[PDB]
Amino acid sequence: KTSEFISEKSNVWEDQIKIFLQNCVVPRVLFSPSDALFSSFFIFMAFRTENLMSILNTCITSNILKTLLFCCTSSEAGNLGLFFTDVLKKLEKMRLNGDFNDQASRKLYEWHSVITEQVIDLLSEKNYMSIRNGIEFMKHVTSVF
Amino acid sequence: NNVWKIPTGLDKIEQEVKKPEGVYEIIRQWQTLRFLRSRYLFDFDKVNEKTGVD
Amino acid sequence: QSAISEIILLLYTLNLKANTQNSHYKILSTRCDEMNTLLWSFIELIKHCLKGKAFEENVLPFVELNNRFHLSTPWTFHIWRDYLDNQLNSNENFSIDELIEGAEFSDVDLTKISKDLF
């Protein structure tokens, strides 16, 4: 029943791609883990490949991860780490299934490089909050890197 | 008797909060960021381990 | 003595005042997170023990929660989503956007976004 719903809903539907991340998935992910896993699953299975790639590119880049990992608490950092682990695991399985080879190679590697740069930058700061946050986030994400 | 003289009721818990908008002139940055995470998230690259760039 | 709504609102609006204190961050983060987890666990207990009509009787219905006290939307939905899904699934008479009608949705800025997607 839910998939039937999401079918017509997806038939129905950058400004939206901005506000969606702003007030719908970032607030949801910083909650308990289940909300993060659910934001991950609903990011897929609810959009087309073009709009999905555009949304993920707008989230990964634009330099939001660096500060947003400074602001949040410890457990909020853990949750956001779980969300990134899920999205990257699914992306890497999609790649290693050969489905995306035309230009997704360069874009995927660019995403990996930008995330690596952001983490390497935030992991190097004098405060205590940034250090503990980065440590927890990597302790979650390093399982699939 | 004192701790039983405190007024308890739904009318007192309202304590209305402060609107998200924050006017423009390491804990203060933390609080201001926690409060601004909802309204203007994408205007966050300017922080960069420094004073809030307005 | 109808303490349920008073207690939920108190815990919530207390964690905010805890956020606005001044101390070492190493204790501020831990205190804020501890209060957050306490509130979450309390609501899990309330949803576990009060079901049926007793819930809707003593849990301060949605629109007041979101328009009078300005709770952040995630907490509102964290309370009400289970009951809304139950009333929607079995009694197919009503529909969403009606059983949650009137909410101001204050920080959302529903302009430039489909309320259907929301």
- Measure CB to CB from residue B30 to each of A26, A27, A71 and give the nearest one: A71
Facing residue for A73 by CB, picked from C33, C40, C74: C33
Is residue C52 within 8 Å of residue A94, measured between CB atoms? no
Name residues 25-44 of chain B within 8 A of C (Cβ).
26-27, 30-31, 34, 38-39
A61: DSSP letter:
S
Cβ distance of B42 and A64 shorter than 8 Å? yes
DSSP letters, chain C, are: ---HHHHHHHHHHHHHHHHTS-S-HHHHHHHHHHHHHHHHHHHHHHHHH--HHHHHHHS--HHHHHHTS---HHHHHHHHHHHHHHHHHS-TTS-TTTTTTT---TTT--TTS-TTT-
Report whether A58 contacts A17 (CB < 8 A): yes
Taking CA atoms, A51 is separated from A16, A43, A45, B35, C40, in Å, by 11, 10, 12, 30, 34
Q: Do C25 and B31 touch (CB under 8 A)?
A: no
Of the residues C2, C4, C10, the best mutation for testing chain B's interface (the one with the most B CB atoms within 10 Å of its CB) is C10
Residues C117, A129: C-beta atoms closer than 8 Å: no
